[PDB]
From Swiss-Prot, chain B:
Localization annotation: Periplasm
Family the UniProt entry places it in: Belongs to the periplasmic pilus chaperone family.
GO cellular component terms, A-Z: outer membrane-bounded periplasmic space
Membrane spanning stretches: none
Protein name, as recorded: Chaperone protein FocC
InterPro entries named among the record's database cross-references: Ig-like_fold, PapD-like_sf, Periplasmic_pilus_chap, Pili_assmbl_chap_C_dom_sf, Pili_assmbl_chaperone_bac, Pili_assmbl_chaperone_C, Pili_assmbl_chaperone_CS, Pili_assmbl_chaperone_N
Keywords: Chaperone, Fimbrium biogenesis, Immunoglobulin domain, Periplasm, Signal
Entry function: Involved in the biogenesis of the F1C fimbriae.
PROSITE patterns, alphabetized: PILI_CHAPERONE
Length: 189, 189
């Protein structure tokens, strides 16, 4: 069937557009593909445009969605902002195919670079995770002792609690290309 | 979701196999994982074999894909060759799009005229912007700026040119063998 080429899209301020690949490997099927953008509050938002908003995909094919910054200077410049790309495929015939993927808008000139963000996570046994960076960080493979903990996403300058059945802390993050990083030992307070 | 352990795989001539880590980080999801290799023109190619080509992941799992040289000694020996490893994760309903992770596989012959770390600094820029790469390596150029206008990311094939649609100083970064960003380099038109 249909596939998307990414699990997240980073939009670096200054870029005129970013692309998202949409593919169909089946020569015999046809789809209508509709897409739109929502803010983090769950509403349709016009600060980013995606085009074409509706297209037909007939057979084995690769199509590209373009995402354009129409923000017009109205975004926080000191942290990332989170949007959601919604794509829906309607087969040519309740049977629609729907995905939502993160769109992270990243302002120019943040002082901590993306690759140094993960190693700044602070853990407090009370565990509370604190993120003193301007990035949204996706934490996975989180372990405290021999116990495997749940995945979490920590917002810029935010805190999240991870339940543990009571009480070394290690983990990986998902990077900008959707890959797993190397294992990291957290900063424990 | 499903995440790969790397964004690119270097296959050094003579190695019998290279491994690629594939992981499902979510205990609530299940997947079928289908993988194949393409050449640089985007057509399925059998000079490299990936196995298993089809497998399933139920819950939190880590698997290893093996990539095997079946080139039969017919690769060019004076330049890298580019292949595309495609890993498609198809989600089981418990409704959603499959996700295809496409990463670069760079076959690298022994005896190249310059080691990898010297390549980035040889790139040549001509007003026409044309990027000319006189080295035996594929160069992945990011953070490309002409003066103060951000340009699109690009990849320059070994001994090839590429045109980037746009005075000012030209600055850029490249992605190295480990998927990391090099330091900014100053080019001159």
């Amino acid at each position: 069937g249909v596939a998307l080429g990414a699990t997240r899209v980073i939009y670096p301020e200054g870029q005129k557009q970013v692309q998202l690949a949409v593919t169909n490997n089946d020569d015999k099927s046809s789809y209508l593909i509709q897409s739109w953008i929502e803010n983090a509050e769950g509403k349709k938002d016009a600060r980013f445009v995606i085009t074409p908003p509706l297209f037909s995909m007939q057979g084995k094919k690769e199509n590209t969605l373009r995402i354009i910054d129409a923000t017009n200077g109205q975004m926080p410049e000191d942290r990332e902002s989170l949007f959601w790309v919604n794509v829906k495929a309607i087969p040519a015939m309740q049977f629609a195919i729907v995905s939502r993927i993160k769109l992270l808008y990243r302002p120019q000139g943040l002082v901590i670079p993306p690759e140094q963000a993960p190693g700044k996570l602070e853990f407090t046994r009370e565990l509370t995770l604190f993120n003193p960076t301007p990035y949204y960080l996706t934490v996975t493979d989180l372990k405290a002792g021999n116990k495997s903990l749940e995945n979490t996403m920590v917002p810029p300058q935010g805190k999240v609690t991870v339940n543990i059945p009571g009480g070394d802390i290690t983990y990986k993050t998902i990077n900008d290309y959707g890959a797993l990083t190397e294992q990291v030992r957290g900063v424990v307070k």
